[PDB]
Each structure stands twice: as structure tokens, then as C-alpha cells.
Design an enzyme around this catalytic site. Structure first.
Site, mmCIF file in Angstrom:
data_model
loop_
_atom_site.group_PDB
_atom_site.id
_atom_site.type_symbol
_atom_site.label_atom_id
_atom_site.label_comp_id
_atom_site.label_asym_id
_atom_site.label_seq_id
_atom_site.Cartn_x
_atom_site.Cartn_y
_atom_site.Cartn_z
ATOM 1 N N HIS B 527 -13.495 -18.031 -12.992
ATOM 2 C CA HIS B 527 -13.145 -19.365 -13.449
ATOM 3 C C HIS B 527 -11.698 -19.640 -13.069
ATOM 4 O O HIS B 527 -11.060 -18.857 -12.360
ATOM 5 C CB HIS B 527 -13.355 -19.507 -14.961
ATOM 6 N N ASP B 529 -7.908 -21.222 -14.862
ATOM 7 C CA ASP B 529 -7.247 -21.493 -16.133
ATOM 8 C C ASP B 529 -6.939 -22.972 -16.319
ATOM 9 O O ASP B 529 -6.918 -23.455 -17.455
ATOM 10 C CB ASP B 529 -5.964 -20.670 -16.239
ATOM 11 N N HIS B 599 -9.710 -16.396 -10.329
ATOM 12 C CA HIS B 599 -9.551 -14.972 -10.578
ATOM 13 C C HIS B 599 -10.768 -14.431 -11.316
ATOM 14 O O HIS B 599 -11.484 -15.166 -12.003
ATOM 15 C CB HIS B 599 -8.281 -14.690 -11.390
ATOM 16 N N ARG B 609 -7.886 0.120 -21.805
ATOM 17 C CA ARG B 609 -7.036 -0.610 -20.868
ATOM 18 C C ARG B 609 -6.294 -1.684 -21.646
ATOM 19 O O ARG B 609 -6.919 -2.536 -22.283
ATOM 20 C CB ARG B 609 -7.858 -1.214 -19.728
HETATM 21 FE FE LIG Z 1 -7.761 -15.885 -17.089
#
Ligand SMILES: [Fe+3]
Ligand SMILES: *[C@@H]1O[C@H](CO)[C@@H](O[C@@H]2O[C@H](CO)[C@@H](O)[C@H](O)[C@H]2NC(C)=O)[C@H](O)[C@H]1NC(C)=O
Ligand SMILES: *[C@@H]1O[C@H](CO)[C@@H](O[C@@H]2O[C@H](CO)[C@@H](O)[C@H](O)[C@H]2NC(C)=O)[C@H](O)[C@H]1NC(C)=O
Ligand SMILES: *[C@@H]1O[C@H](CO)[C@@H](O[C@@H]2O[C@H](CO)[C@@H](O)[C@H](O)[C@H]2NC(C)=O)[C@H](O)[C@H]1NC(C)=O
Ligand SMILES: *[C@@H]1O[C@H](CO)[C@@H](O[C@@H]2O[C@H](CO)[C@@H](O)[C@H](O)[C@H]2NC(C)=O)[C@H](O)[C@H]1NC(C)=O
Lengths: 362, 646
Positions: B527, B529, B599, B609
Site C-alpha cells: 500500500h 501511506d 512499500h 523484530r
Molecule cells: Fe507503512
């Protein structure tokens, strides 16, 4: 536990957040330890008193400030003037609250302050004191908790048990005491001893102290609130002030000193009555007249005082007095106006503003 | 019957889905009339109540000392009594307040005038061509990016009964239309008919302005869920609410001059009105009115040369006594005074409380601004001109222009190595830099996030550190590292405008090995931002339920031992992989949040993580309301002050 207390100088070794110390004290109390709980409870009480006094000092510095002189044009726009002054007050308060050490630690939640106002830790403190052979301190703590809450059951049994214990008949003292109540007790004791000058001096010292304390308690009563609805500007601030006004009008009776378990009514009226009687007994009418005027202001119906006020009026200059001695004292005027205005505002508010959607449960 | 509009909108949408045209036209017309009536009623009540009980002011007092607290109590009680009376009358007038609360989505769809599209379709279905072409024209004017409806009104014009004059708007306000008509019809160098229209276009404006000032007292705007831990005192609530109300009032003069046909608002509206008026008045020969208009312009900018010459020429041609006789228009003077006082108050608020504000007008004198703001503005202009000179010199030294000018920076901090640039990473506005922080800092951040926890903001971390649950040094290091990464990433991209935050939170991902069976779906779909991507449609949308002010984005990793959960850049088709970055310690990835950079994050495997994500915006209107609180808290804890208690 108030012996080693000083607002000007507070030792830095015991500057912990209130909730942390209180939680540690309770956890130790449940763990059967006694001395550590006693010390931590004393620390917590001292911290609470320091926070209250810091709030008082912060709110006395800001409101009592000279009003700046504005430009000629700005005087034609009222709302901007009012809100600009209020904004200046808020900025000054915020700047001066980054000062005093007690305000640089964690802020206690609302419920902790609510229970501390209810004087509940004194119960645990008295139980700890009993578990450590400090009987006068335990007696004082029990009496101190009983004074605020006189209708309980187990505390009465505890107090009766302590009174049954020999020797414990004179250490009955109020730990959370104030200056004006002690001064009032001393003044009344002197008055019943047919001593006049000492009564006048002590009572006159007592008056402004009580006025200052009452004004401080009014000022520090404007607490926060929990947000529960969204409204327009005017309504969503008027509801907040209605709540604050309720908590404000619930303030005069709290400050009333109690003796013999029966709180006295019309405290300022009693003050002025004793003052007037003493001044008359000293035959100095020049001070006697304002006291009578003020008390008659506070109570519109009293045959005895109407009679001697008429007798005072019959002698216009026999005692040598002028027209500057038949008007009330400024302080009494201030107090009466504040009380009456608050009562009237609450009465007007509780007819139109708050929604009537809750009723008695049947 | 004063029913909520969104219910009628939903009913009409359902009927249109069924396809009952009389139902949809009835529902849409009822909803529109309901909205109009609601707005009119609210305006009338709110403007009558505040005029029935005028604001009082009796400040004549000089307090004798120790008689000080009582005066404050009396003043406060009188002010709040006035406020309570006003609120009582307003509540008794307005009525049931449930209907006035509507969410955003219907507000946006009202702005786009889609109900008018529904009306045009329905009216065409029932042969109501006049209203159909009216709706088509008003939707076209509202949003001129639909060729299909251009063909629609062309075909409407093909069949008879249609006239050019029939193209009447139904939504645009009167003053804007009058002003545009006056300017357009004066452009033909015809001076007579120019004077009245503009004059009319003057009067309505002022009236229109008044109404906006009476429609700004709205509900407070909490920052999402920040009302659960709101702990503001009464005198803080008044200040915050009034500051927001004043800001929303002063924001109106940049909205009354924004027409949807133009992409940017008009500049210096009233002075332009007066300039056109004076030119037309001189051409017609009404000389006194001309000198009046020139003089009232000169009250706004006192240092304009051409109009100084014009006024001098008028005064030399005309008798000097008449030039002295007439002064500026009174209404403009009153408007200027009110606006200037409001700007002064707002700038004081910006100086003290750290609540941002941007001036919407260009005519403010520089005497109303405090000193610190002046210094900051001077520094910002200096750095902007320095960046402009640097980029000009760099261009003189010369997608390649974008690839060589828009990025490639100084990297002011030491120990930073440009690892992956834009050219290697197969795209534009992508940077991968290494060694932002050493291993120790990563260890302390990991300890901070392990002690307490997906929602740990910097403000929350600092508050918990103050409480004592988490060590303070970790929170201080977090704040310093976020400021450091802001500075370096901003300076690398050669950004002239200063950069502001929008959100910054730490997070940890814990692999759950028991739910990984047949979990072939991606952890998060690719998607962007800035906008929302509708996958196969291959077109974005700046739709407000997705944040439209985030401009730059950055991420920095902390741990260096796991498997899976990589980071990659993917083209618009959401299939191909352009590049990937292997997670490690001290790795930072930065990119513009535009639609050109989608991204994607793969699913994680065994281990933990943890990383920090950051989003920066360029518009100073959208900055966090907690960053100033965090700055104040750090100033509290690590910059102590002293004042004499004695
Ligand atoms: Fe993001
Ligand atoms: C109220 O608080 C202010 C805030 O600091 C203080 O004002 C100081 O007043 C003294 C003399 O009155 C000056 O010398 C200081 O410079 C003032 N401090 C400032 C301006 O920050 C003081 O604590 C209080 N003011 C009073 C009691 O008049
Ligand atoms: C409350 O303050 C007001 C104004 O500061 C005063 O009210 C006057 O009170 C006297 C008697 O106390 C009356 O004779 C006057 O007519 C009142 N004036 C007004 C304008 O109300 C007084 O200081 C306080 N009020 C009272 C009733 O004492
Ligand atoms: C300038 O235009 C005005 C616009 O009507 C002419 O008429 C004046 O209108 C204003 C409006 O209140 C008033 O001053 C008078 O009613 C009108 N007369 C004058 C002398 O002002 C006005 O006549 C025009 N001036 C010239 C010199 O043509
Ligand atoms: C992040 O915070 C400060 C801001 O740069 C760093 O430096 C501290 O601030 C003073 C002010 O110049 C410096 O002189 C000191 O080196 C630091 N303060 C103290 C008390 O040592 C600070 O070092 C950074 N945080 C960490 C954890 O390094």
C-alpha cells in the site's frame, strides 16, 4: 508526624511520587511489617500536605496581580479583553507551576486524592501504631478519623476499647489541626474567664486567617473532570462550571471547626458576636458599632440586637462617633457577597442547564 | 420534519440501488432542504442569543492590599454568571442536540455534491431536463474533472428546450459569483456596468463574513483517543477551547476566497476589490469616490509606490481641500482593527503555549509579532535562501536532474555512510543509510520495549520513565535519537521548508509459530501511506479517511538476528519486486510517502523484530499536540530551575 515539616525547606531524600509510596505502604501493611509501614505512611501524608501547600502558594501568586492598562481601541471589544486577561492568568500559572519541587514528580490520579480527602489512611496508620506500642498516637489517629466520619461502627468500638485502657484520657488531639480553630478555642476559653483584651487580640488574629484559608480552599477547588460528552462551546463549558460550582458550594461547612461533636452554625456570626460583646464590655463604641452592623447583616432577625442597635442610635454623639461607624466591615461584605452570589448562581443553574434524565429508583 | 440527513441519504442510496427514481429524487431533495433548514436555524439562534445578552465589562477597580483575593472571586463570579445566562438562553432556544452530530463521510459526500449527480440521473429518468442540466452544471462547476458529464450536458444541449442562460449554479455563494462576473465583464474594458456589481460584491462579502463568524463555535477536536487521559484544569479548558475557536475563526478569510474551479485561493481579496473599484471609478469619472478608494487601500499597505503616484496625481488634479475632506471607508477600518487584535492574541498564544498558527493574510504589520518568532522567521528565510543558492550552483555545475538534485546530502553527523542510494535501489527518493546508532543504544531501546508494551509513544515512554517503571536514560536516548534521525533525513533531501513530525512510535513483532500453518497470505498488503490504493484499479485517491498530509517516511531497525519479515519496494501493479533491504543493526530506510513508492513487509519467522517508524509532514498546521508536552517534560526533568521560597 507533622513535627518535621517545612514548606520552605523539604529534605530531598523522601521526594517520591505519592502513589508509589502509598502502594508500598499498603503492600508492607498486608505483609505484617509495621515500622516500615509507619514510616511510609508518614512520608505519604507529608507529601500530600506539601502538594496542597504548593498549590495554594501557586494560586496566591497569580490571581492577585495588577491588571495591565490596555490600548484605547481594545476597550471597545469586551470579549477579547476578558479572554486575553484570562489567557495571561493561565500562562502565568503554568509558568509558575514549573517551580516548587513538589510539582516535578508524578501527578496522583483523581481517586487517590478523593480517598485522601476522605482521611482513610489514618485507619491503617492507627492499626500500625497499635501494633508498635504508640498508644497516644493511635488514640489521636482514631479520634482524627472519627471527627470527619461520626456515623461509623467499628471505629466507635475501637475508640471505646482505647478509652477503657488506663491512662489514655488526655492524649485526645486532632492531628490535622488548623491555626484558626486553636485560636478560636483559646479565645472562647479566655472569654468565659471574663478576660476581654486577650479575647479581642486572639479573635482579631483569628479572623483574617480563616478568611485566607477559606479563599484558598475555594481557589483550589476548581479540579479537573472526566470527559463524557461532546457539545458546543458554551454548553460544554457551562456544564463543567456547574460541576465546579457544586463542589465549591460544598466548601463552607467543611471548614467549620467542631467542638464536643456538634459543629457550630454561623461561624463568622459567632465570631462577630463575641467581638461585639467584648468591645461593648470595654466601652469602646468606636469599634463596637461595625461588629453589630456586620452581625445584623448576617442575620436579619434578632430582637435583642435591633434593640441595642436602636439604643446605640439614640446617642448620636454622646460617645463621640461619626457616620463612618455604621457601615459593615469590608471583609464581611466580601464574604457575604461571595456566599450569596454562589447560592444564587447554583439555584439559577439547577433549573435550565443540566438535563433531567435520571430519577429516583423505585 | 427536521430528521437526520444521513438517514435520508442512505434511504435514497438504497432506492437508487433498487432503481426507484421518484423515491430517490424525493429523498435527495428532502435531505438537501433539511440541511439548509438546519444551518439556517442554528445560525439564527446562535446569532440572536449572543445579541440579546451583550458581553459586560466593568473593570474600574483599584484593590487595597490584603483585600486582593475577594476582588478576584467577585470578578470571576460575575463573568461566569454572564456566561451561564448566555448558555441558558442558548440551550432553551436551540432544542434537541442529537440531530446536529454527523460524522465526516457525509460531510465529504456533501462537499462533492454527489446527491446532485443523483438528482440529474433521476430527473433524466423522468424527463425533467431543466433540473437535470442544472444539476449537471453545478456538479461540473463543483468538480471539473469528469469528461463524461461534459458529454452529458452536450447531449442535453443537443435536444431542444435548453438555453445558455439556463446554466445557473445552485451551490456557489453569491459574493464569489458576483465578483467573478464583475471582473470578467470589466476585462472587456467596459467601465459602466463594472461599478455596481463590484459594489454589490463588496456588501455581501461583509454580511457573508459575519455568518462564518457565527458558525465556528463547534465541538472540541480531541486527538482521537486522547480524551481518556485528558487531565486539564478549568482555566486550561477555557484557553484551549477559545484558542481553537479563534484559530477556526481566523481560518475563514482563506476559505471565503477559494473557488473549486481554481486550485489555489485568491490573494489579498479586499485590497484587490478596492483596487479594481478605484480603477473603474476613475474611468467612469466619479473622482471623489476614486480618491476615497485609493485612500482606503493605502490604509492596508502604507508603502506602495504606484498607488502613491496615483493618489498624488488625483490630488494635484483635484482641489486639495476635497482630497483632505474624504477619509477611508469605515467598515474596512473596523474589520482591520478586529482582525489585528485577533492576530495579536493568536501570536501570543503561539509564542507561549507552543500551539502552531500560520498567518492567512499578507498585510499584517510586523509590530504585532514577538521577538522570538521574528528571529525564527529570519533564520528560516536565511536557510531557505542558502538552499536555493546551493541548488542553483549545483545545477550550474551540470529523471537525471531529479536523481542528482533532489537528493544527495551533506550527512552532517559523523559515522554515517551512504550505503544504498537512489540509482542502485532502482527508483526515486529512496535512501538506505547505515550506522545511525551503535549497538548499545539498540540494546537499551530493546530493554525499554521489553520492560513494558505496539503503542509506546515518546511521550508515553517519558511519562513512564518519570513514574519510575522504566529507566530514564532509555527514554532520553529515545528522544535524542528521534531528533537526530529527523535532522539527518531532512538535511539529506535538500528541503527548504522546515520539517515537522506527525507520528512516531516504537513497535515489536513477536512471531507466533503455532498459527503459521497454511498462513500463505502476506503479513500486510502492499500500500501507500499517503493515499489508498484500490489494487487492480491502478489509481490512487486523496481520500480523507487516509491521512493526506504525511509527506516523508523513515524507518530504523534495531536488532540483527532473526529470519523473515523483510522490507521491499513494489511497483504499482502490486506484483513485481523492485528492491529489498536486508534487516540488520542500525539500518535506516527513508522515502517519500508519495504514490510513486509502494512499500511492502513480508511475514516474520522465529524470533523478535523491533524497529522505530517515523512520519514527517511539511504543513505546520498538522503537528502533534504531544510533542510540545514532551519537550516541556524533558525541560522539567533535565533542566531544573530555582526560585526563592523565602
Ligand atoms: Fe507503512
Ligand atoms: C509572584 O511570582 C512571580 C513569578 O516569578 C515573582 O515575581 C518576582 O517579583 C520580584 C519582586 O517583586 C522580582 O524581583 C522578580 O524578578 C519577579 N520574578 C519574575 C518576574 O520572574 C514572585 O515570586 C511573585 N511576585 C510577587 C510576590 O510580587
Ligand atoms: C456586594 O457588592 C455590591 C457592589 O459591590 C454592594 O451592593 C450594595 O449593598 C448596599 C448594602 O450592603 C446597598 O445599599 C447597595 O444598594 C448595593 N448596591 C448594589 C449595586 O447592589 C455591596 O458591597 C454588596 N451587597 C450587599 C447587599 O451588601
Ligand atoms: C458617484 O456615485 C454615486 C453612486 O450613486 C452617485 O450618487 C451618490 O450616491 C451616494 C450614495 O449614498 C450619495 O453620496 C448620494 O446619494 C449620491 N450623490 C452624491 C453627490 O454623492 C454620485 O453622484 C457620483 N458622483 C459623481 C461626481 O458623479
Ligand atoms: C540526548 O540529549 C542531550 C541533547 O543533545 C545530549 O546531551 C546532553 O545535554 C547537555 C547539554 O549540552 C550535554 O552537554 C550533555 O552531554 C548531556 N547531558 C548530560 C546531563 O550529560 C545527551 O547526551 C543525549 N542523550 C544521551 C543518552 O546521550
Amino acid at each position: 508526624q507533622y513535627e518535621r515539616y517545612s514548606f520552605r525547606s523539604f529534605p530531598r531524600d523522601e521526594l517520591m511520587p505519592l502513589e508509589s509510596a502509598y502502594r508500598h505502604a499498603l503492600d508492607k501493611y498486608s505483609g505484617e511489617h509495621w515500622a516500615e509501614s509507619v514510616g511510609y505512611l508518614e512520608i505519604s501524608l507529608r507529601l500530600h500536605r506539601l502538594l496542597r501547600d504548593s498549590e495554594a502558594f501557586c494560586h496566591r501568586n497569580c490571581s492577585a496581580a495588577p491588571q495591565p492598562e490596555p490600548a484605547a481601541g481594545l476597550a471597545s471589544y469586551p470579549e477579547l479583553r476578558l479572554f486575553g486577561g484570562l489567557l495571561r492568568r493561565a500562562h502565568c500559572l503554568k509558568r509558575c507551576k514549573q517551580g516548587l519541587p513538589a510539582f516535578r514528580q508524578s501527578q496522583p490520579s483523581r481517586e487517590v486524592l478523593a480517598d485522601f480527602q476522605r482521611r482513610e489512611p489514618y485507619k491503617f496508620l492507627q492499626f500500625a501504631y497499635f501494633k508498635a506500642n504508640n498508644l497516644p498516637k493511635a488514640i489521636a489517629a482514631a479520634h482524627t478519623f472519627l471527627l470527619k466520619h461520626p456515623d461509623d461502627e467499628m471505629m466507635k468500638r475501637n475508640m471505646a476499647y482505647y478509652k477503657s485502657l488506663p491512662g489514655a484520657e488526655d492524649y485526645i488531639k486532632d492531628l490535622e489541626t488548623k491555626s484558626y480553630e486553636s485560636l478560636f478555642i483559646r479565645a472562647v476559653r479566655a472569654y468565659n474567664g471574663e478576660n476581654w483584651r486577650t479575647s479581642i487580640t486572639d479573635m482579631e488574629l483569628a479572623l483574617p486567617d480563616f478568611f485566607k484559608a477559606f479563599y484558598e480552599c475555594l481557589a483550589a477547588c476548581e479540579g479537573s473532570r472526566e470527559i463524557k460528552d461532546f457539545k458546543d462551546f458554551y454548553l460544554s463549558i457551562a456544564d463543567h462550571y456547574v460541576e465546579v460550582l457544586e463542589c465549591k458550594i460544598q466548601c463552607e461547612e467543611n471548614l467549620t471547626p467542631v467542638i464536643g461533636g456538634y459543629p457550630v452554625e454561623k461561624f463568622v456570626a459567632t465570631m462577630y458576636h463575641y467581638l461585639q460583646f467584648a468591645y461593648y464590655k470595654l466601652n469602646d463604641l468606636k469599634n463596637a458599632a461595625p461588629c453589630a452592623v456586620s452581625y445584623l447583616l448576617f442575620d436579619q432577625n434578632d430582637k435583642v440586637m435591633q434593640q441595642n442597635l436602636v439604643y446605640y442610635q439614640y446617642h448620636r454623639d454622646t460617645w463621640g462617633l461619626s457616620d463612618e461607624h455604621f457601615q459593615p466591615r469590608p471583609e464581611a461584605v466580601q464574604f457575604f457577597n461571595v456566599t450569596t452570589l454562589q447560592k444564587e448562581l447554583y439555584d439559577f443553574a439547577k433549573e435550565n442547564i443540566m438535563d433531567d434524565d435520571e430519577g429516583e429508583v423505585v | 420534519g427536521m430528521v437526520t440527513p444521513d438517514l435520508l441519504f442512505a434511504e435514497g442510496t438504497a432506492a437508487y440501488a433498487r432503481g426507484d427514481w421518484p423515491g430517490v429524487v424525493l429523498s435527495m431533495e428532502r435531505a438537501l432542504r433539511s440541511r439548509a433548514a438546519l444551518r439556517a436555524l442554528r445560525l439564527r439562534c446562535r446569532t440572536q442569543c449572543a445579541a440579546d445578552f451583550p458581553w459586560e465589562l466593568d473593570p474600574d477597580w483599584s484593590p487595597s492590599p490584603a483585600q486582593a483575593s475577594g476582588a478576584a472571586a467577585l470578578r470571576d463570579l460575575s463573568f461566569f454568571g454572564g456566561l451561564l445566562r448566555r448558555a441558558a438562553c442558548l440551550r432553551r432556544c436551540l432544542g434537541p442536540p442529537a440531530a446536529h452530530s454527523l460524522s465526516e463521510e457525509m460531510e465529504l459526500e456533501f462537499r462533492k455534491r454527489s446527491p446532485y449527480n443523483y438528482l440529474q440521473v433521476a430527473y433524466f429518468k423522468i424527463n425533467k431536463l431543466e433540473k437535470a442540466v442544472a444539476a449537471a452544471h453545478t456538479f461540473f462547476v463543483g468538480n471539473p474533472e469528469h469528461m463524461e458529464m461534459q458529454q452529458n450536458l452536450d447531449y442535453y444541449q443537443t435536444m431542444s428546450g435548453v438555453k445558455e442562460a439556463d446554466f445557473k449554479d445552485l451551490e456557489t455563494q453569491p459574493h464569489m459569483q458576483e465578483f467573478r462576473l464583475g471582473v470578467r465583464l470589466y476585462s472587456e474594458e467596459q467601465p459602466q456596468e463594472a461599478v455596481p456589481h463590484l459594489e454589490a460584491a463588496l456588501q455581501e462579502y461583509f454580511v457573508a463574513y459575519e455568518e462564518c463568524r457565527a458558525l465556528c463555535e463547534g465541538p472540541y477536536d480531541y486527538d482521537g483517543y486522547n480524551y481518556l487521559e485528558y487531565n486539564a484544569d478549568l482555566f486550561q479548558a477555557i484557553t484551549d477551547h477559545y484558542i481553537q475557536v479563534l484559530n477556526c475563526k481566523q481560518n475563514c478569510v482563506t476559505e471565503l476566497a477559494s473557488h473549486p474551479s481554481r486550485e489555489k485561493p485568491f490573494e489579498d481579496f479586499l485590497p484587490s476589490h478596492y483596487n479594481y473599484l478605484q480603477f473603474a471609478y476613475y474611468n467612469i469619472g466619479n473622482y471623489t469616490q476614486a480618491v476615497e478608494c485609493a485612500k482606503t487601500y493605502l490604509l492596508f499597505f502604507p508603502n506602495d509606490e504606484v498607488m502613491n503616484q496615483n493618489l498624488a496625481y488625483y490630488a494635484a488634479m483635484l482641489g486639495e481641500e476635497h482630497t483632505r475632506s474624504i477619509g477611508p471607508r469605515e467598515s474596512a477600518k473596523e474589520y482591520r482593527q478586529r482582525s489585528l487584535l485577533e492576530k495579536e492574541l493568536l501570536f501570543f498564544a503561539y509564542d507561549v503555549f507552543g500551539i502552531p498558527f500560520v498567518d492567512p493574510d499578507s498585510w499584517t504589520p510586523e509590530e504585532v509579532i514577538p521577538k522570538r518568532l521574528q528571529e525564527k522567521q529570519k533564520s528560516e528565510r536565511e536557510t531557505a535562501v542558502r538552499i536555493s543558492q546551493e541548488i542553483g550552483n549545483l545545477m550550474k555545475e551540470i529523471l537525471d536532474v531529479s536523481r542528482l538534485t533532489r537528493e544527495g546530502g551533506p550527512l552532517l553527523y559523523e559515522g554515517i555512510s551512504l550505503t544504498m542510494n537512489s540509482k542502485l535501489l532502482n527508483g526515486s527518493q529512496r535512501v538506505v543509510m547505515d550506522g545511525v546508532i551503535s549497538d548499545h543504544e539498540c540494546q537499551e531501546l530493546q530493554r525499554l520495549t521489553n520492560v513494558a508494551a505496539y503503542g509506546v509513544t515518546v511521550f508515553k515512554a517519558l511519562k513512564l520513565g518519570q513514574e519510575g517503571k522504566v529507566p530514564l536514560q532509555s527514554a532520553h536516548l529515545y528522544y535524542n535519537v528521534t531528533e537526530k534521525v529527523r535532522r539527518i533525513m531532512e538535511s539529506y533531501f535538500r528541503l527548504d521548508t522546515p520539517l515537522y513530525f506527525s507520528y512516531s512510535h516504537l513497535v515489536c513483532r513477536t512471531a507466533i509459530e503455532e498459527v503459521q500453518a497454511e498462513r500463505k497470505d502476506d503479513s500486510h498488503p502492499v500500500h501507500v501511506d499517503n493515499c489508498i490504493l484500490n489494487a487492480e484499479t491502478l489509481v490512487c485517491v486523496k481520500e480523507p479517511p487516509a491521512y493526506t498530509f504525511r509527506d516523508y517516511s523513515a524507518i530504523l531497525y534495531l536488532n540483527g538476528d532473526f529470519d523473515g519479515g523483510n522490507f521491499y519496494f513494489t511497483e504499482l501493479d502490486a506484483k513485481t519486486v523492485t528492491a529489498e533491504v536486508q534487516p540488520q543493526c542500525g539500518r535506516a530506510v527513508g522515502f517519500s510517502s508519495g504514490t510513486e513508492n509502494p512499500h511492502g513487509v513480508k511475514a516474520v519467522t522465529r524470533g523478535q523484530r523491533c524497529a522505530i517508524a517515523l512520519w514527517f509532514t511539511l504543513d505546520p498546521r498538522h503537528s502533534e499536540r504531544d510533542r510540545v508536552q514532551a519537550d516541556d517534560l524533558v525541560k522539567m526533568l533535565f533542566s531544573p530551575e530555582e526560585m526563592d521560597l523565602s
